[PDB]
Nucleic acid binder design. Structure first.
Ligand SMILES: [Mg+2]
Ligand SMILES: [Mg+2]
Ligand SMILES: [Mg+2]
Ligand SMILES: [Mg+2]
Ligand SMILES: [Mg+2]
Ligand SMILES: [Mg+2]
Ligand SMILES: [Mg+2]
Ligand SMILES: [Mg+2]
Ligand SMILES: [Mg+2]
Ligand SMILES: [Mg+2]
Ligand SMILES: [Mg+2]
Ligand SMILES: [Mg+2]
Ligand SMILES: [Mg+2]
Lengths: 288, 201, 49, 157, 167, 138
RNA sequence: CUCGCCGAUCAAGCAGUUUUAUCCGGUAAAGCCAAUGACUAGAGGCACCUAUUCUCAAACUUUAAAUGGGUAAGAGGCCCGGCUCGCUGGCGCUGGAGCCGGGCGUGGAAUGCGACGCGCCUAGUGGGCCAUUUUUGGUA
RNA sequence: GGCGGUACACCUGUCAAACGGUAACGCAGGUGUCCUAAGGCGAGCUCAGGGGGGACAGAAACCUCCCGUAGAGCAGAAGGG
RNA sequence: GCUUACGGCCAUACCACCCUGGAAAUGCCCGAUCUCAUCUGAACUCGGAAGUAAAGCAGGGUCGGGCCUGGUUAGUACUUGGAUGGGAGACCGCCUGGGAAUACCAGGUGCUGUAAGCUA
């Protein structure tokens, strides 16, 4: 069988971009998202970056530059325990809060927290903030889903709804919000308000506790020890949205000084490298 | 056929047999290695060439004739298993022939293949034992009369058909830098994996 | 009765006879071909200052 | 007679370098081209839109118009014996900033500071480039480098 | 050590019927009574007159089972094989497979309405962590010390199902 | 509605016409049976003599034209159909859509269908109208 | 005809030329143990397979000259303040462009030259031939 | 000159001598069409080939794993992408 | 120093095999009620937190392949301009300037921007 990886293979081999080899960036969609028109002359084109891990949600606002895009404001999902949400830091309701936390924190540093307060109450209807004359214009950014398949009800659009309710003017439509019946092509806003306030999570805690309590303890183990029940879901997120709108500013942790103690071994120098093969040759000639 | 005086000088760009040039007849020479070709490097230390001194092109029929002329003299003076002839010129340039005759559409059909040679390029190479030097020079001398132009019969300083000198070939064998494989040697540098170094020892 | 097809023999001597003059770059270049959206606003920046 | 096609003879100029194929790196898209800067022209076979003609690949002109995706350039093209200023529309993937004037701008900024430094100190530093002058008189020491005898080598074939 | 349990990922089964028509349509009903899900029609790729098939012609059906249904049907297909397979029935990359000539011994009564059909069982063996090669974002490779081998897949067949490898 | 096309034919040179071909003579395609060209003088021009049998019924036609002249060449295309009952006055055929068409007209086939041995006919289309000539079994 | 004539009292600008600076190319050579295509010979591992070897490309190329092509070498500059806009927009400067005022000659490479400046009318010609080098068809 | 050919309107590679241009009845070729999608856009997917496997099933049917810089495909000539 | 998000240059970053590592984080992992989703909850989407390093990932190893850089090849090959230079010719030498490429040899193997967190 002929060898596929020979000298002629690697000599002709052209590697992809590093962010492409890692599978993190889609350069076909990035070009159409971060590149600004040439008749704008360094007008920053902002975008909301929403990323999901197995335990955390990252929401950032950036604008592209040649030496790397700068992050204007970043709100993480592990900051919700400061506002009350100590459980389920990766569900749809926690995505609406980190988007709201990113919207209110951005408007704070830009001096736009008095104007464009968004929807204080959660109604689920399509809301797009309006720019009032005389006052500074609303912040207009765009959504960056990345490699996440944008289906109806994805949590990427949960932070999108949290940002447009905070005051951000992001263009979108209610076709991909949870509660859009594609059969009738109508958006039922009442279903969306349930996912925003975690009401769909409460119905799961009740469907298990009233059927078999054994599985309820495995699925919601940390929900029991933290003292949150199925009846304390809607109110928990409501008072969390209130705390986010009050103090959205995030202070950095005190810089802890470290002696920079390395835990990895260093590369072998040229002396240690040649001396090792010199010992293997000498040890090979003694055995014969 | 047309005499070789008409296709002696390299006037045209190289016109090889390819997808665009179809219908080329087979070259006159088809065998390039003769003698005991499956001999090791330490059997035929001597090497002698037929170096060219003119930038011209040698026909395929001349390479065939001079090969047999040098071969018939080596088999009678050194035996059929005491030499190795390697013709180092392959006929690749296709010379053209105009229609048998105005010149409306004068581009001609292929006539044959002709090997283009440079000043200093080896035409033939013969390796044999160290005591057959006077026979190879005479065998290669008789083959010059089958070629147009001027050729030189130079006894090379390399070790047979290899590219290493004779004064260094014996030292590179003891240092395991060269291993014989058929009619040539393998240059084994000191920059590979250590597994193949232990195989040599 | 064939003739000569194409030639550029004496052309380089005729070009440099009166010299090869570069285009005259005048101050205040023209404004034809510019973006009509940009020119429409620029004419509004001149009738208001 | 040759064909008058727009891409005849562009087999190698519009090709991409070895092991440099694929998508365009996203730095060429985020470069700002104002109106009146010197830009080069170098066509790319990846973007078949707004590509320049082969008579402009390698030329250099100044920008007179900027649009959404492209840039209007004023290139001087000699036709037969006359040089004409051509206004062409080339997208930003086939152009780049010309560093031919950056050596002049850096030299001006260094001149504007040398005269204000000599004015407040009272010197006469000359601000003007000069060709490579003949080498001055210098002593060549032979303390540790004695002249080594060279001579032609015999001919060997 | 616990994250290296040589479990089964999917059990692939297919009936390669000769051509389309009512014979192929009835073959899909066999996969509905065994797997419990609608199969898919796999049309041909190239036309070959030696077999009597054309391009874009529905030739074979196939289905995939993942969970405990994959373990049940695979066990129900090994009792026909007498819980023993050949030595060369294992591929050099883990997974193996076999085949039966009649599906009646697979827990379904023989009916005179629909004809008898023979499927082709192919089990794709796995290991916790193989999903890193299937997910889109952050797609990676498995590794040398984690992918299954032939000697590792045969001993799993001898311990879980007490199989006998015939040389 | 997509009734038909507009080209319906194409003209080409007379010297490019080959034997056993087709060409338009007197407004109807004909089967060229033999072609011969001859000179006219010292520096004579290629005088082409054509003779073709009309493919439809009868009435062979001929014509003289120079080699460098142009003459209309028709589009000769033949389609296959499946036979149906011909017990009526018109011959019936079916297309790929599955619908029947009855526009044609022979004696050896109109009664053949009643006794078995089904066949498929090849209807040839040309400038004027359509007609069926060849018959091959399967 | 518009000027310069007075020489860098002046702004200058220009060039079949160099210098400095920055781009463009795929020819000569080179390579094929690198891809496409052609090609000779042994050797190793159980016809292929691996590592080598001889010889080539005008419609092949990783690499790549020499000669050569474009551009930049200042007041039409540099810097600063204010104003205008329906364009642009988190951000009366957020970009951008226009407008107005002020500050600053050590005209900020070599050599040469009045600008071969701005127009108008315009005859003849539209069979060429030869040489050094490059080069196509052809035995020539 | 005639016959032949169209070098008569166009396109690809080369000739063409590393900007562009550059001839011959120079070379290898292509065109007078095709497409309601083979146009536009979004999403998902990865191709040619090779290896190990798997009832009938074989060198060619289909299922599946592994390698796979594109060596496939992109209506047509060729080049580029 | 490390772990993530978004990147710039796009192999000094890739490829094969081996070894070591989980503080935070990451990954695997545990489920299919809701949203969504396929032949199949594998993928995609969604809900979650029993286990903690098998793999991803990260850091090392290889007289590693590749890539990158330098030396050398060589002032060689080729080339601008010149001669009433040589030569039957092919072609070659010289004068005046520019000046490569493989093989071979050696060294190196990601750098870095913005934002957040942790001192294994
Ligand atoms: Mg040599
Ligand atoms: Mg003329
Ligand atoms: Mg003429
Ligand atoms: Mg003249
Ligand atoms: Mg052509
Ligand atoms: Mg001036
Ligand atoms: Mg004329
Ligand atoms: Mg005239
Ligand atoms: Mg033609
Ligand atoms: Mg040229
Ligand atoms: Mg461990
Ligand atoms: Mg290495
Ligand atoms: Mg090097």
């Amino acid at each position: 069988v002929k060898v596929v990886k020979n000298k002629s293979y690697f000599k002709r081999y052209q590697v992809k971009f590093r962010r492409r080899r890692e599978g993190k960036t889609d350069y076909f969609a990035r070009k159409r998202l971060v590149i600004q028109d040439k008749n704008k002359y360094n007008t920053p084109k902002y975008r909301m970056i929403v990323r999901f891990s197995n335990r955390d949600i990252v929401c950032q606002i950036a604008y592209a530059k040649i030496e790397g895009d700068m992050i204007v404001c970043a709100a993480y999902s592990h900051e919700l325990p400061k506002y009350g949400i100590s459980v389920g830091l990766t569900n749809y309701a926690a995505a609406y809060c980190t988007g709201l936390l990113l919207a209110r924190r951005l408007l704070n540093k830009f001096g736009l927290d008095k104007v464009y307060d968004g929807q204080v109450e959660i109604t689920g209807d399509e809301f797009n903030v309006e720019s009032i004359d005389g006052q500074p214009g609303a912040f207009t950014c765009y959504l960056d889903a990345g490699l996440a398949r944008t289906t109806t009800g994805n949590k990427v659009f949960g932070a999108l709804k949290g940002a447009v309710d905070g005051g951000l003017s992001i263009p979108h439509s209610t076709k991909r919000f949870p509660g859009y019946d594609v059969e009738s092509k109508e958006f039922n806003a009442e279903v969306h308000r349930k996912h925003i306030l975690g009401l769909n999570i409460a119905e799961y805690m009740r469907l298990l506790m009233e059927e078999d309590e054994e599985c309820y303890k495995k699925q919601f183990s940390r929900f029991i020890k933290n003292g949150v029940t199925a009846d304390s879901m809607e109110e928990m997120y409501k008072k969390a949205h209130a705390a986010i709108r009050e103090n959205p500013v995030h202070e950095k942790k005190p810089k802890r000084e470290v002696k920079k103690k390395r835990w990895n071994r260093a590369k072998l120098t040229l002396a240690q490298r040649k001396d090792r093969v010199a010992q293997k040759k000498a040890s090979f000639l003694r055995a014969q | 056929r047309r005499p070789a005086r008409c296709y002696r000088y390299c006037k045209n760009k190289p016109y090889p047999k390819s997808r665009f040039c179809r219908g080329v007849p087979d070259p006159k020479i088809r065998i390039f290695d003769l003698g005991r070709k499956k001999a090791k490097v330490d059997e035929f230390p001597l090497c002698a060439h037929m170096v060219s001194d003119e930038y011209e092109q040698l026909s395929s029929e001349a390479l065939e004739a001079a090969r047999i002329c040098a071969n018939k003299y080596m088999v009678k003076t050194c035996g059929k298993d005491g030499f190795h002839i390697r013709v180092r010129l392959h006929p690749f340039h296709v010379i053209r022939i105009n229609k048998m005759l105005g010149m409306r559409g004068a581009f001609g059909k292929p006539q044959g293949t002709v090997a283009r040679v440079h000043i200093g390029q080896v035409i033939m190479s013969v390796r044999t034992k160290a005591q057959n030097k006077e026979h190879v020079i005479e065998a290669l001398r008789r083959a010059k009369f089958k070629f147009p132009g001027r050729q030189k019969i130079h006894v090379s300083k390399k070790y047979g058909f290899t590219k290493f000198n004779t004064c260094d070939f014996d030292n590179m064998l003891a240092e395991k830098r060269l291993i014989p494989d058929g009619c040539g040697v393998k240059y084994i540098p000191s920059r590979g994996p250590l597994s193949r170094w232990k195989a040599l020892h | 009765a064939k003739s000569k097809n194409h030639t550029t023999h004496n052309q380089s001597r005729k070009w440099h006879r009166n010299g090869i003059k570069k285009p005259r770059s005048q101050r205040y270049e023209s404004l034809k071909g510019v973006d009509p959206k940009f020119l429409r606003n620029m004419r509004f920046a001149k009738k208001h200052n | 007679t040759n064909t008058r096609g727009k891409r005849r003879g562009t087999r190698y100029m519009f090709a991409r370098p070895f092991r440099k194929h694929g998508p365009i790196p996203l730095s060429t898209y985020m470069r700002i081209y104002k109106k009146g800067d010197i830009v080069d022209i170098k066509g790319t076979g990846t973007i078949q839109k707004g590509m320049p003609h082969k008579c402009y690949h390698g030329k250099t002109g100044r920008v007179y118009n900027v649009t959404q995706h492209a840039v209007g350039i004023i290139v001087n093209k000699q036709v037969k014996g006359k040089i004409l200023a051509k206004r062409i529309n080339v997208r930003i993937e086939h152009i780049k900033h010309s560093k031919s004037r950056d050596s002049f701008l850096q030299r001006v900024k260094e001149n504007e500071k040398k005269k204000v430094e000599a004015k407040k100190e009272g010197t006469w530093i000359e601000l003007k480039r000069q060709p490579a002058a003949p080498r001055p008189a210098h002593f060549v020491s032979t303390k540790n480098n004695k002249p080594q005898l060279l001579e032609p080598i015999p001919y060997e074939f | 050590n616990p994250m290296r349990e040589l479990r089964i990922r999917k059990l692939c089964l297919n009936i390669c019927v000769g051509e389309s028509g009512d014979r192929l349509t009835r073959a899909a009903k066999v996969l509905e009574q065994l797997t419990g899900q609608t199969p898919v029609f796999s049309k041909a790729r190239y036309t070959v007159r030696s077999f009597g098939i054309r391009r874009n012609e529905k030739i074979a059906v196939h289905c995939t089972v993942r969970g405990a249904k994959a373990e049940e049907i695979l066990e129900k297909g090994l009792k026909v094989r007498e819980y023993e397979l050949r030595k060369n029935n294992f591929s050099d990359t883990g997974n193996f497979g076999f085949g039966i000539q009649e599906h009646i011994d697979l827990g379904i009564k023989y009916d005179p309405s629909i004809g008898i059909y023979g499927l082709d069982f192919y089990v794709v063996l796995g290991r916790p962590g193989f999903s890193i090669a299937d997910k889109k974002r952050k797609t990676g490779r498995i590794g040398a010390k984690h992918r299954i081998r032939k000697e590792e897949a045969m001993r799993w067949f001898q311990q879980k199902y007490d199989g006998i490898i015939l040389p | 509605s997509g009734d038909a096309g507009a080209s319906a034919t194409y003209p080409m040179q007379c010297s490019a016409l080959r034997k056993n071909g087709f060409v338009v003579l007197k407004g109807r395609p004909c089967k060229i049976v033999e072609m011969s060209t001859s000179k006219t003088g010292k520096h004579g021009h290629a005088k082409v003599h054509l003779v073709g049998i009309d493919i439809f019924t009868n009435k062979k036609y001929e014509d003289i034209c120079p080699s460098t002249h142009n003459m209309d060449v028709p589009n000769i295309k033949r389609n296959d159909y499946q036979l149906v009952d011909i017990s009526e006055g018109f011959l019936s055929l079916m297309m790929d859509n599955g619908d029947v068409r009855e526009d044609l007209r022979g004696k050896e086939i109109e009664n053949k269908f009643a006794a078995g041995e089904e066949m498929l006919v090849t209807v040839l289309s040309a400038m004027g109208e359509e007609s069926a000539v060849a018959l091959k079994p399967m």
